[PDB]
């Protein structure tokens, strides 16, 4: 048994880290509708920029 490395199966998040930064704002082409061909647009429950 020669000693080598091994990516071990302990899933402990101590001595390891992810860069949990802020979630980016999603692009939203689905929100506002063209009511009849014209501007009757909708939000439908988000921070719609």
């Amino acid at each position, epitope marked *: 048994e020669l000693p080598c490395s091994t990516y071990a199966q302990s899933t402990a998040a101590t001595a390891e880290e992810i860069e949990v930064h802020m979630p980016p704002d999603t692009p939203d082409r689905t929100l*506002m509708s063209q009511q*009849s061909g014209n501007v009757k647009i909708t939000v439908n429950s988000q921070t719609v920029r």
Partner: nanobody
Amino acid sequence: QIQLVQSGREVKNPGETVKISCKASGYTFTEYPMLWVKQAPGKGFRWMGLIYTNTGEPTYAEEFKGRFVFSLEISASTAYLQINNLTNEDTATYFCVRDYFISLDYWGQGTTLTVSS
């Protein structure tokens, strides 16, 4: 408000052109197009797309491929349908629809394109 004052008689030859520029009173800028409409002899409505007044050009019809293509004078708030290469059945009515009254809420009354021998 929204009202596309459509052009008069658009005379066309066999394979000739058609151009109905409709001066769109109520050419806005903000949030909505002007739903253009082709008008056949019996069909009632036949939508030629959405295209704004200060938007400027029409997102055209779907099944109207052939001659028809939307255009407009964007700074004047005016739209138009130009249909070059005039076939036999090119005689029809044209309209815009200005998105105030938040559907296509300024319906064009019709512009008479007459392309015949």
